[PDB]
């Protein structure tokens, strides 16, 4: 399995950086679990295979090219040209995200999240992984 933590901004909340965590089995195309947090609270949800097919068919694009847009938004894979935007009521837990061009923000999708019950604990786990992962790529670097 893979995971990828990514840093974002809600349009509801300019100065608060939020963290998206995505977790999936190598192809993001196969569906994923998703977590949002803001350092104070957390929320979670899920997306699936046929949904992503349908959602690319929904925009008339090739699947894999649309998965490209999802990698880039959700996985920080943003090319130099790409600006992405995040929207969420914490109350309804309705998420949606977008890309900004043409002097507009363009929606790229929507989720039902749920407010997570053990906020500080999925946070603890989240950042320990990060301390470890930095250290592994560091040790390869020293050798080179």
């Amino acid at each position: 399995m893979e995971r990828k933590i990514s840093r974002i901004h809600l349009v509801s909340e300019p100065s608060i950086t939020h963290f998206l965590q995505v977790s999936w089995e190598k192809t993001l195309e196969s569906g994923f679990v998703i977590t949002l947090t803001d350092g104070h609270s957390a929320w979670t949800g899920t997306v699936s295979e046929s949904e992503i097919s349908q959602e690319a068919d929904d925009m008339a694009m090739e699947k894999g090219k649309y998965v490209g847009e999802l990698r880039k938004a959700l996985l920080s894979g943003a090319g130099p040209a790409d600006v992405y935007t995040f929207n969420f009521s914490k109350e309804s837990c309705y998420f949606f995200f977008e890309k900004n061009l043409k002097d507009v923000s363009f929606r790229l999708g929507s989720f039902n999240l749920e407010k997570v019950e053990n906020p500080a604990e999925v946070i603890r786990e989240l950042i320990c992984y990060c301390l470890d992962t930095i250290a592994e790529n560091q040790a390869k670097n020293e050798h080179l």
């Binding site: 929904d58 925009m59 008339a60 040209a81 977008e98 043409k102 999708g109």
Partner: protein, 211 residues
């Protein structure tokens, strides 16, 4: 939308490369909507659309790719892959574009234009252009005759030519038509794909419509 129609009358024609043929299109875009007239030189088709139809039809064609109507309209003003069907006489014109680094879709639902707009957007302008072009021919032919009266004054007293290749024959209009009709008319009157029209007549088109 009345101002959209008024802009349209006075817009020039563009030329569109389909895969299947070409089209001629005049379009007028604002933040308010658009009006479009299209032709394949056999038939003519019309659409007019406000921002209500824009955000509905764009939300259908482009499910999750949200914008204000005016930002879509702004991009169409830039003007991509064109295809079409006549289904009944909806010339449905299907446009694939790039915007935001995303593929985009618009379909124009173009009905057979009314005979009244065919008159106002083609026949009357195109007639008015032929009459105006003929008055230009008439004024170049007076100008050619005036330059001959001038040059004949030289031929009447002294004034030999130095460069043995500058000679003009005296201008005479009937024979200039006679040679044109055999040598030039075949090519020049050819409609082709309408690229000749859009390439050299749009200034006169814009002027005659505004007259």
């Amino acid at each position: 939308m009345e101002e959209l129609e008024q802009g349209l009358l006075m817009q020039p024609w563009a030329w569109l490369q389909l895969a299947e043929n070409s089209l001629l299109a005049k379009v007028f875009i604002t933040k308010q909507g658009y009006a479009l007239l299209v032709s394949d030189l056999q038939q003519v088709w019309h659409e007019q659309v406000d921002t209500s139809v824009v955000s509905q039809r764009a939300k259908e064609l482009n499910k999750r790719l949200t914008a204000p109507p005016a930002a879509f309209l702004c991009h169409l003003d830039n003007l991509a892959t064109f295809s079409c069907d006549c289904v009944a006489d909806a010339l449905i014109l299907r446009v694939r574009s790039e915007l935001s680094g995303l593929p985009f879709y618009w379909n124009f639902h173009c009905m057979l234009a009314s005979p009244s707009l065919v008159s106002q957007h083609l026949i009357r302008p195109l007639m008015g252009m032929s009459l105006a072009l003929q008055c230009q021919v008439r004024e170049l032919a007076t100008l050619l005759h005036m330059k001959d009266l001038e040059i004949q004054d030289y031929q009447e007293s002294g004034a030999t030519l130095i460069r043995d290749r500058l000679k003009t024959e005296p201008f005479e209009e009937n024979s200039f038509l006679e040679q044109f009709m055999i040598e030039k008319l075949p090519e020049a009157c050819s409609i082709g794909d309408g690229k000749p029209f859009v390439m050299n007549l749009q200034d006169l088109y814009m002027a005659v419509t505004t007259q």
